[PDB]
Amino acid sequence: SSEEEWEAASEPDYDTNEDLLYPYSPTPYFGMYHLVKIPIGRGLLHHVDYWGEGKVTNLGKIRGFPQSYNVNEQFALVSKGHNKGKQIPNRIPVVSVDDSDTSSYIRDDSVKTVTISTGPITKRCAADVARIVNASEGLVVAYGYSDNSDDIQNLERELGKKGLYYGAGYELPADLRTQTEFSTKRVFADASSINNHLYNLVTGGDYINAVKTVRSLVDNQGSDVCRDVVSQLVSHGIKNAMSFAYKLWHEGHKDIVEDYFPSEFQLILDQKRIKLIGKHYNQALKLDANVDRYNDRLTWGDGKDNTSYRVSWRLISLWENNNVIFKILNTEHEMYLKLDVNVDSYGDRKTWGSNDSSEKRHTWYLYPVKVGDQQLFLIENREYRQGLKLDANVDWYGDRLVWGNNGTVADNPEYYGFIIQPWQ
């Protein structure tokens, strides 16, 4: 029988594994008694290996850990490698892989790191892993499962109820990178850690891993964290927020932009007719009534009109070198904004509309920034790296010329921010 094969079995290899002197390791399941639960005292348990067998070498590959507690079925024995058939080191027992309940042995919310591999993650197992991992600073690493498995689906769901979430590309210390047995892993971390991870993936331009992260976050009760990260990204002048929103918009995740990003992002990303209002001077942009000798038109804020076809624009979005870039289209004339090749005596450049649109100076970055509750955008020419501003001086009609600014527009959203509104 299973019991008798276990009773019959050599004791665990405590040369290659550390002997943690766990009192319930050499006993079967005794959870019917008021046992002494670990951890004892105020700290967390360092490391539980769920379905672990201790450090197992096989065909030159390593699985398991010499210093973890190992949750396993009560009669389970080492499966492979030289220790095959021995007893499991530091073994915390469960009745069955079905019940997978450690509540007699391990206190709720008490483990720093849970690793899990080899065994199946049933719903009960996922729930037990979530029960023991500490919500505020826990970490769960699932090794060798496929991302679409019922195993990972059970785990992500139970961890999300507790406040742990997948981190795509989450970097592990060297001692959690020893599992050369497995070719895949999936890391779950605490709410604050994932907040920081996803923010830094976006500011770093790693949109593949940012999209993977946010999708799992929103799908597993992480909406508070998503909202906080988004707020940081659209408040602090991060143009990678625009690039992140673009990839969400085009790769199947419109829900996340619709539900968590400022309403303006939908106008921007779908090339809808918009008004562009200089916040400081409060004037909507238009093009000049007349052309110059090159058939181009100057760009102006209008001192009175904020409704007519003359103040309608569209943003054209394109992807270049891991960034979203924009062209700014005037719908009255079907002309594209650029900055003058000639500077004035302050180094500033007049803004012009042209029928043509194939130069780098036709392309622009948007930097989302917030003045209290008002979402704004800084608009910066990609070739000249100048942010747009309206002239401190009015003309005879009360209109303001639009210039590229020599000098950063980042220190000051009340001066250099634009409001984007729907035109219709």
Kindly give the pairing relationship between strand 69-73 and strand 185-190: unpaired
Do residues 361 and 380 touch, judged by C-beta distance below 8 A? no
In three-state secondary structure terms, 293 is coil
The residue among 196, 222, 241 that closes a domain is 196
Do residues 164 and 140 touch, judged by C-beta distance below 8 A? yes
The residue among 179, 196, 213 that closes a domain is 196
Do residues 378 and 387 touch, judged by C-beta distance below 8 A? yes
Helix H or strand E encompassing 338: strand 335-343
In whole angstroms, give the CA distance from residue 148 to residue 192.
25
Do residues 201 and 216 touch, judged by C-beta distance below 8 A? no
In whole angstroms, give the CA distance from residue 74 to residue 27.
8
Give the residue carrying structure tokens 């100048």: 386
Domain contains 278: yes
In whole angstroms, give the CA distance from residue 355 to residue 336.
6
Q: Resolution reached, in Å?
A: 1.8
Structure tokens belonging to residue 73:
């079925």
In whole angstroms, give the CA distance from residue 311 to residue 263.
20
* Other Cβ atoms closer than 10 A to 54: 28
Domain contains 145: yes
The residue among 196, 231, 254 that closes a domain is 196
Domain contains 264: no
Give residues with Cβ within 8 angstroms of 59, minimum separation 6.
none
User: Which residues face 164 on adjacent strands?
Assistant: 190
Query: 340: domain CATH number?
Result: 2.80.10.50
In this structure, the chain runs to a length of 424
Full domain range(s) for residue 60: 2-196
Domain count, the chain: 2
One domain for residues 192 and 104? yes
Do residues 371 and 355 touch, judged by C-beta distance below 8 A? no
In whole angstroms, give the CA distance from residue 165 to residue 69.
23
One domain for residues 277 and 178? no
